[PDB]
């Protein structure tokens, strides 16, 4: 009995010479796990990864 | 009995010399897992990856 | 019986020479796990990773 | 019986020569685990990692 | 019976020559675990890691 | 008999060798063998001898 | 008989070797063998002898 | 008989060797073998002898 | 018989060796073997002898 | 018989060796073997002898 769940995330990453340049923005290069059961509300935002709001 | 669930994410990545340049935006090059059961609401946003809102 | 849960996140990362330059923004290159059962509210924001709000 | 829980986060990272330069922003390159059961409120923000609000 | 709990965080990190330069901002490169059951309030902020508010 | 009068002679010489090598993730797995990845200069006037071997790079011999 | 009168001779010489090597993650796994990744200069006037070996780099011999 | 009158001779010489090596995470695993990653200069006038070996770098011999 | 009259001779010489090595996380694991990572200069006029070995770097011999 | 009249001779010499090594986390694990990471200069006029060995760096012999 499982609801709103991330069970298993397995990542093997062997990068080499990685570089990231970001001006006034949002950059993600990793591992992100978000588990949420219930979110409610007007104009509401849930589970935003790399999100730019102007 | 499983609802709103990400069970297994397996990634093997052997990058080499990766570079990312982003100005005022959103860039994702990783692993993102989002599990949500119930989201409700007007103008609501759920599970946005690489999302630019102006 | 599991709800609103991240069970197992396993990451092996062997980077070498990684550099990150960010001006006035948000950058994430790691491992982020967020588990939330219930979030409620107008204009509310829950589980934002790499989020720029102007 | 588990709700609002992060069970197991396992990370092996063997970086070498990593450098991070950030001016007036937010940068995260580590391991962040946030578990919350219930958060409620207008204009409320919960679980923000790498979040810039202007 | 577990609610609002981070059980086990295990990290092995073998960095070498890491340097971080930050001007007027927020930078985190470590291990952060936050567990909260109930947070309530308008304009309230809970579990912010790398958060810049202007 | 060798007579040099007012002469200039270069005999058995490597004069100028210039090499630039840029790599990233160079990896070598070798079992019971010979792998050469370097820079090698060998200069010899006289090598004399039956069955002799001079200037071998990356050389495997299992003579039986 | 060797007679040099007012001569200039370079015999068995390596003059100038210049190398630049830039790597990142160089790794070598070697079992019962020979791996050479360096810079090697060998200069010899005279090597004399039956079955002799001069200037071997990365050399495996299992003569039986 | 060797006669040098007013001569300049370079015999068996390595003159100038210049090397720049920039690495990051160089790792070597070697079992029962020979691995050379360095800089080596060998200069010899005369090597004489049956079955002799002169100037070996990264050399494995299991002669039987 | 060797006669040098007013001569300049360089015999068996390594003149100038310049090396710059920049590393970070250099690690070496070696079992029953020979690993050389350094800088080596060997200069010899005369080496004489049957079965002789001169100027070996990273040398493994298990002669039987 | 050797006669030098008014001569200048360099025989068996290493003149100038300059090395700069910058490391961070250098670690070496060695079992029953030979690992050389240093700077070595060997200069010899004459080495004479059957089965002789001169100028060995990182040398393992288990002759049987």
From Swiss-Prot, chains A, B, C, D, E:
GO biological process: adult locomotory behavior; amyloid fibril formation; behavioral response to cocaine; cellular response to copper ion; cellular response to epinephrine stimulus; cellular response to fibroblast growth factor stimulus; cellular response to oxidative stress; chemical synaptic transmission
Broad class of where this protein is predominantly found: cytoplasm
Domain of life of the organism encoding this protein: Eukaryota
Transmembrane segments: none
Binding-site list for Cu cation: 7
KW Repeat (keyword) present: yes
Expressed in which tissues: Highly expressed in presynaptic terminals in the central nervous system. Expressed principally in brain.
UniProt key word Ligase: no
GO (cellular component) term, any one: mitochondrial outer membrane
Alphabetically ordered keywords of this record: Acetylation, Alzheimer disease, Amyloid, Cell projection, Copper, Cytoplasm, Disease variant, Membrane, Metal-binding, Neurodegeneration, Nucleus, Parkinson disease, Parkinsonism, Phosphoprotein, Repeat, Secreted, Synapse, Ubl conjugation
First and last residues of every Sequence repeat: 1-13, 14-24
Modification Phosphoserine occurs at: 44
Post-translational modification: Phosphorylated, predominantly on serine residues. Phosphorylation by CK1 appears to occur on residues distinct from the residue phosphorylated by other kinases.
Location relative to the cell: Cytoplasm; Membrane; Nucleus; Synapse
A Gene Ontology molecular function term of the record: phospholipid binding
Role this protein plays: Neuronal protein that plays several roles in synaptic activity such as regulation of synaptic vesicle trafficking and subsequent neurotransmitter release. Participates as a monomer in synaptic vesicle exocytosis by enhancing vesicle priming, fusion and dilation of exocytotic fusion pores. Mechanistically, acts by increasing local Ca(2+) release from microdomains which is essential for the enhancement of ATP-induced exocytosis.
Record note on quaternary structure: Soluble monomer. Homotetramer. A dynamic intracellular population of tetramers and monomers coexists normally and the tetramer plays an essential role in maintaining homeostasis. Interacts with UCHL1. Interacts with phospholipase D and histones. Interacts (via N-terminus) with synphilin-1/SNCAIP; this interaction promotes formation of SNCA inclusions in the cytoplasm. Interacts with CALM1. Interacts with STXBP1; this interaction controls SNCA self-replicating aggregation. Interacts with SNARE components VAMP2 and SNAP25; these interactions allows SNARE complex assembly and integrity.
Disease: Genetic alterations of SNCA resulting in aberrant polymerization into fibrils, are associated with several neurodegenerative diseases (synucleinopathies). SNCA fibrillar aggregates represent the major non A-beta component of Alzheimer disease amyloid plaque, and a major component of Lewy body inclusions. They are also found within Lewy body (LB)-like intraneuronal inclusions, glial inclusions and axonal spheroids in neurodegeneration with brain iron accumulation type 1. Parkinson disease 1, autosomal dominant: A complex neurodegenerative disorder characterized by bradykinesia, resting tremor, muscular rigidity and postural instability. Additional features are characteristic postural abnormalities, dysautonomia, dystonic cramps, and dementia. The pathology of Parkinson disease involves the loss of dopaminergic neurons in the substantia nigra and the presence of Lewy bodies (intraneuronal accumulations of aggregated proteins), in surviving neurons in various areas of the brain.
Record remark: domains: The 'non A-beta component of Alzheimer disease amyloid plaque' domain (NAC domain) is involved in fibrils formation. The middle hydrophobic region forms the core of the filaments. The C-terminus may regulate aggregation and determine the diameter of the filaments.
Family designation: Belongs to the synuclein family.
Record's protein name: Alpha-synuclein
Native source organism of the sequence: Homo sapiens
């Amino acid at each position: 009995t499982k609801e709103g769940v991330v069970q298993g995330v397995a990542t093997v990453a062997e990068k080499t010479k990685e570089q990231v340049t970001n001006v006034g923005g949002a950059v993600v290069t990793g591992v992100t796990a978000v588990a949420q059961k219930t979110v409610e509300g007007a104009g509401s935002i849930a589970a935003a990864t790399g999100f730019v709001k102007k």
